[PDB]
């Protein structure tokens, strides 16, 4: 149960915020879990997804397919995975939109900022566990 007066449990306000969120908020909204190996390596459960990550689809009709993230259509709240496509009528290839909560990240596209994100998440989790323990 929510306690804080700044927290609203209004369904109307929640849906308005979700479907009118700006791009930086949508980046946080399209987060994906890490694989078990990455979770034990980094002590991180979930991260915002980005182009160049390698994912495994665990839900839907394209389950167990693997590939790299080729596009993050934040306007459609969807990601595109290479070779997870379908055929149009005309015989051309069109990407299939996958929600990032239906995939699991198996390889991270790493740079300095991503390492900073992972490090500060790990440090916060350890600090919280130490304080509550």
């Amino acid at each position: 149960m929510k306690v804080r007066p700044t927290v609203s449990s209004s369904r109307r306000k929640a849906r308005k915020a979700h479907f009118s969120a700006p791009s930086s908020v949508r980046r946080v909204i399209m987060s994906a879990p890490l694989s078990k190996e990455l979770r034990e390596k980094y002590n991180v459960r979930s991260i915002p997804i980005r182009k160049g990550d390698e994912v495994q689809i665990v839900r839907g009709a394209h389950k167990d397919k693997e590939g790299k993230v080729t596009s993050v259509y934040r306007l459609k709240y969807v990601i595109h995975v290479e070779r997870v496509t379908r055929e149009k009528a005309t015989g051309q290839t069109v990407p299939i939109g996958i929600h990032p909560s239906n995939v699991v990240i198996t390889k991270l596209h790493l740079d300095k900022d991503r390492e900073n994100i992972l490090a500060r998440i790990k440090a916060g989790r350890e600090q919280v566990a130490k304080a509550k323990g």
């Binding site: 149960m1 449990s9 209004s10 369904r11």
Partner: protein, 260 residues
């Protein structure tokens, strides 16, 4: 809104040979022009008897009658048939009213939800807690859009003494669905008789059951009411020797033979 249906300029076209005498929107060049207005029978018009905020929403109830009802609900909570008739799963409960030792709840003993849930399963409220857990359903109607999405049954109410048991048991029991908590000195009829139905299943602490008498002695202007009936066992009264020895002989049977 008090201005609803009245933000229009409209006049009746008068008695004539063609149309009804409802006021009609003046002007031209739009669909609204010439259409009916202001009537409760008109589209985009004012409703009949518009609702006002000075309707009587709140009900003043005598404090003596509130105390009477709370005492009756507390007495009904100690009757095991009424708990079953209200729908609580109490077949494995060892005793009604159920009193748990305050050493099992005081301080931080059940500050964790797992510990509180384990205590409920140990004392026998587990089937009622599981009944609430399995009862969750989606509500039928517009209440889903209006912030009331789900319905579930009521579980046990844990009554505690804040002075002797503390208040961390509240945090411990809070996340379990259907389980409510209440201090012994602020008992609530809405919890003691949910939906106006008597027989709420209550788990008492020993401190709360020891403080209840002082709670009812400290209520100014109220005494526990005297009943109009001394002996509620009607069968015992009717079939006692004192009444039966003075009766007339029966003038018939439960079934009467047809004469002609």
């Amino acid at each position: 809104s008090e201005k609803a249906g009245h933000q229009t300029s409209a006049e009746s076209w008068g008695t004539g040979r063609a149309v009804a005498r409802i006021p009609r929107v003046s002007g031209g060049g739009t669909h609204r022009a010439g259409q009916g207005a202001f009537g409760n029978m008109c589209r985009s018009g004012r409703m009949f008897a518009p609702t006002k905020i000075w309707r009587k929403w709140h009900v003043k109830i005598n404090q003596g009658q509130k105390r009477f009802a709370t005492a009756s609900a507390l007495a009904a909570s100690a009757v095991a048939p009424l708990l079953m008739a209200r729908g609580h799963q109490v077949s494995t409960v060892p005793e009604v009213p159920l009193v748990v030792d305050s050493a099992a709840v005081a301080g931080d003993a059940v500050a964790k939800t797992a510990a509180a849930y384990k205590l409920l399963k140990a004392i026998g409220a587990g089937p009622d807690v599981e009944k609430v857990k399995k009862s969750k359903k989606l509500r039928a109607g517009k209440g889903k859009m209006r912030g009331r999405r789900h319905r579930q049954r009521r579980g046990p109410l844990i009554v505690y003494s804040p002075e002797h048991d503390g208040k961390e048991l509240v945090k411990g029991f809070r996340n379990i669905p259907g389980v409510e908590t209440c201090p012994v000195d602020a008992l609530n009829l809405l919890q003691l008789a949910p939906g106006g139905h008597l027989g709420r299943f209550i788990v008492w602490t020993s401190a709360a059951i020891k403080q209840l008498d002082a709670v009812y002695e400290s209520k100014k202007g109220f005494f526990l009411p005297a009943n109009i009936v001394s002996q509620a066992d009607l069968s015992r009264l009717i079939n006692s020797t004192e009444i039966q020895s003075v009766l007339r002989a029966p003038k018939g049977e439960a079934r009467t033979k047809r004469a002609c």
